[PDB]
Each structure stands twice: as structure tokens, then as C-alpha cells.
Amino acid sequence: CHPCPWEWTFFQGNCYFMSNSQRNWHDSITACKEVGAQLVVIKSAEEQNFLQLQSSRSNRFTWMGLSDLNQEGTWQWVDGSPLLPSFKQYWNRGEPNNVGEEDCAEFSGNGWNDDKCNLAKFWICKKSAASC
């Protein structure tokens, strides 16, 4: 028994995969579903710091499963849960600014940025680990 599939990173009972290719946000959602996973939805501050650190070290602009597509300015996770007030701190300075209509959230440097949903970026999938 091993808790995660090969090349997946285990963290606090879940498995994480960072892509080595780039897609737009809607295709990133599909990419994760095809491996029985979900474009990463963040549930805790520890998990946030864990993901941002890898995004900073790798220096890769990376999609997360969050958008304000349904209502501009109200951010929602792809599993339907709302962005909580205790997560607003992770936006980068001056963000979210929706310049040129940016509806999808990404890891950018030390925090989050809203960027155009049609741009190709790396992504991270999340699924729960098996019990060994």
C-alpha cells in the first residue's frame, strides 16, 4: 500500500500533483477530473502555505480552483464553497484588480492573483490519499 499515486505529493491526508505543462483554467479543471481529482481547493492556512511555497520555489504561475465567474467580485471554489474572510490576506498587493477582465485565481509569487481565464498556466490537482 502507498497513499498516493506515483509522482503525487502527500500532505496531511491528501495527494497533490503539479503539472509540467500549461492549460487554461477550464481545461485545467478537466485535466484534474480525468485523474479522479479536483483543481486544488484550499481548506486551511497550513495547506495554503504548503502550496504557495512550492509555487514560489518553482517560480511557476499556477491555477487554483477558484473564480468569480458567476458573480464578479465574489470568489467561489470549484466545489461550491465560498472564499472565507480569513483567506483575503493571501491576495497580492493591489489584487484582485480584474484588469482586462480577470476571473480566475492563480498562485503568483508569494500570494494570489486574478488573471485571464483563457491564459495557459500550470495547475495543481488534489485528491484524498489511500489508507495504509
Ligand X SMILES: CO[C@H]1O[C@H](CO)[C@@H](O)[C@H](O)[C@@H]1n1cc(-c2cccnc2)nn1
Of 26, 38, 35, nearest in space to 120 by CA: 26
- Cell triple for 5: 499515486
CB of 61 to ligand X, least distance (A): 8
* Binding window for ligand X (CB under 6 A); candidates: 10-18, 25-33, 47-55, 95-103: 95-103
* Binding window for Ca ion (CB under 5 A); candidates: 3-11, 16-24, 46-54, 71-79: 71-79
Of 80 and 94, nearer to ligand X (C-beta) is: 94
The DSSP call for residue 123 is E
Collect all residues with Cβ–Cβ distance below 8 Å to 88 and sequence separation of at least 6: none
- Cell triple for 128: 484524498
Residues at the contact surface with ligand X, assessed by CB under 6 A: 94-95, 97, 99, 102, 113-115
